[PDB]
From a paper:
Among VMA inteins inserted at the VMA-b insertion site, we could obtain crystals of the VMA intein from Thermococcus litoralis (Tli). The TliVMA intein comprises 429 residues and is larger than the PhoVMA intein (376 residues) but similar to the size of PI-SceI (454 residues). To prevent self-cleavages during protein production, we expressed both inteins in E. coli with alanine substitutions of the catalytic cysteines 1 (Cys1). We solved the structure of TliVMA intein at the 1.6 Å-resolution. The crystal structures of the TliVMA intein revealed a very similar overall structure as found in the PhoVMA intein, including the three-domain architecture known from the three other reported HEN-containing inteins. The HINT domain of the TliVMA intein also contains the β-strand extension found among thermophilic inteins. However, TliVMA intein probably carries a catalytically active HEN domain capable of binding to DNA and introducing DNA double-strand breaks. Indeed, we observed that TliVMA intein cleaved its reconstituted homing site accompanied by a strong DNA binding affinity as indicated by an electrophoretic mobility shift (EMSA) of the substrate- and product-DNA fragments. Our results demonstrated that the ACD in TliVMA intein induced a second cleavage site in addition to the theoretical homing site. The ACD of TliVMA intein strongly resembles the helix-turn-helix motif common for many DNA binding proteins, such as transcriptional regulator proteins.
Inteins catalyze their removal from a host protein through protein splicing. The HINT domain catalyzes the protein splicing reaction, whereas HEN domains often function independently of the HINT domain. In this study, we elucidated crystal structures of HEN-associated archaeal inteins inserted at the same insertion site (VMA-b), which is located within the A subunit P-loop of the vascular-type ATP synthase (VMA) from Thermococcus litoralis (Tli) and Pyrococcus horikoshii (Pho). The two three-dimensional structures highlighted a modular architecture consisting of HINT, HEN, and an accessory domain (ACD).
Residue numbers in the entry: -2 to 429
The structure:
């Protein structure tokens, strides 16, 4: 076949949020002239959609002008240390990187040639965001019994964080469960501010609850895609949150973590365990809007499968305003850097590097340099811009396993001006 990805590959879009590329195809098929050539077809979209791509060291919105479907006789599945699992055609390209005296160069590598130990470009920061106006019917929308927020701001985002992490929706009641009565009071304050109605705090057998009795309010959250309970296995992050400014995402994430995130001392990581796999993948994209690289793992808990998102390591935690040493954390943000050639090209700044705690010899025999060490090194060798832009956005993630899968299937791709777009179960740079 051609260059393309498995239909379950997520893609971040402005118009539809984070969606499987096969779902995107089903939405867009027919909405433009299609050219068919045997096992390949291309649609030129009547209305281009917006995805995200990498350009000039940043990750910003870019137009996708075409969508492709092909039929492939086999696939390659790539797993990485962070928990990305990408399934693509053998000639589909990923990117490896090298930092030299001249900056960061991304190199295209076909999936058929990827091997364990390679490090592929993934996204740890997604730029952009605007305050999203909540979409209305052009019909006969608008409850008049409550006040309906019209912009997704930090207050609503905080409330959504409590509701998704620790809430239930019954047909006529919104509930938030927590043993901190001050958090329940805060949620009630927000409900008055946002919706003009409030609830009451009920002391229950093993937990307190804030109960807000309003069918219009339930309907508002259901239209947003809020799960009916913690255990919903199919809930998704709302598109409007993925398009929001980082301040809004931060309000949501902080609220989620206070409700159902847990800090593990020995490992140096905040863990979120959710029952929704696509909800977990969506959390990873939200975290990239904060500049955080999540890890992902499937876990067994009392005979059922759960999805663990970890915010791990001192650098990630700083992005939440948390200042903590994590000496038990294994570094996974490793920069491929040609240390010796850079050092010589810059005239061997031995004393200056020693002053930053770097002994150049410790990197001359293939040793890994962390991003944190590279930030310091870079300032002394003329590479600050690469450290503070390109490598603020791109992490080079270790491939742990590659497998050829000899099963034919339909595959999909999109066309962008950058020849790349952001997709995968956690944000990954995909070539087109």
């Amino acid at each position: 076949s051609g260059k393309a990805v498995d239909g379950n590959t997520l893609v971040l879009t402005e118009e539809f949020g984070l969606v499987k590329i096969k779902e995107l195809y089903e939405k867009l098929d027919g909405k433009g002239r299609k050219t068919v050539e045997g096992n390949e077809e291309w649609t030129e979209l009547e209305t281009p959609v917006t995805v995200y791509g990498y350009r000039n060291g940043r990750i910003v919105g870019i137009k996708a002008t075409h969508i492709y479907k092909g039929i492939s006789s086999g696939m390659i599945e790539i797993r990485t240390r962070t928990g990305r699992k990408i399934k693509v055609t053998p000639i589909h390209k990923l990117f490896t990187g090298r930092v030299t005296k001249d900056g960061l160069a991304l190199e295209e590598v076909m999936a058929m040639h990827i091997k364990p130990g390679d490090r592929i470009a993934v996204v740890k920061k997604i730029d952009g965001g605007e305050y999203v106006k909540l979409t209305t019917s052009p019909d006969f929308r608008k409850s008049r019994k409550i006040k309906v927020p019209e912009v997704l701001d930090e207050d609503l985002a905080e409330f959504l964080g409590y509701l998704i992490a620790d809430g239930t929706l019954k047909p006529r009641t919104v509930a938030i469960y927590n043993n901190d009565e001050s958090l329940l009071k805060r949620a009630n304050f927000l409900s008055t501010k946002l919706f003009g109605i409030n609830g009451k705090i009920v002391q229950e057998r093993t937990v307190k609850a804030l109960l807000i009795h309003s069918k219009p309010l339930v309907d508002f959250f259901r239209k947003l895609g809020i799960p009916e309970s913690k255990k919903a296995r199919n809930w998704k992050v709302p598109r409007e949150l993925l398009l929001s400014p980082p301040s809004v995402v931060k309000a949501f994430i902080n609220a989620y973590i206070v409700c159902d995130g847990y800090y593990h001392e020995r490992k140096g990581e905040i863990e979120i365990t959710t029952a929704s796999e696509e909800g977990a993948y969506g959390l990873s994209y939200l975290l990239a809007k904060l500049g955080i690289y999540a890890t992902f793992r499937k876990k067994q808990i009392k005979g059922k499968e759960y999805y663990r998102i970890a915010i791990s390591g001192k650098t990630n935690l700083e992005k939440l305003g948390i200042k903590r040493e994590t000496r038990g954390y294994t570094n996974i943000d490793i920069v491929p850097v040609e240390v010796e050639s850079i050092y010589n090209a810059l005239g061997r700044p031995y004393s200056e590097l020693k002053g930053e705690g770097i002994e150049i010899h410790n990197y001359l025999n293939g040793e890994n340099m962390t991003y944190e060490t590279f930030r310091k090194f870079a300032k002394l060798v003329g590479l600050e811009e690469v450290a503070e832009n390109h490598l603020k956005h791109i992490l080079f993630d270790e491939v742990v396993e590659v497998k050829y899968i000899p099963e034919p299937q339909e595959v999909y791709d999109i066309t962008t001006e950058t020849h790349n777009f952001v997709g995968g179960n956690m944000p990954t740079l995909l070539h087109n």
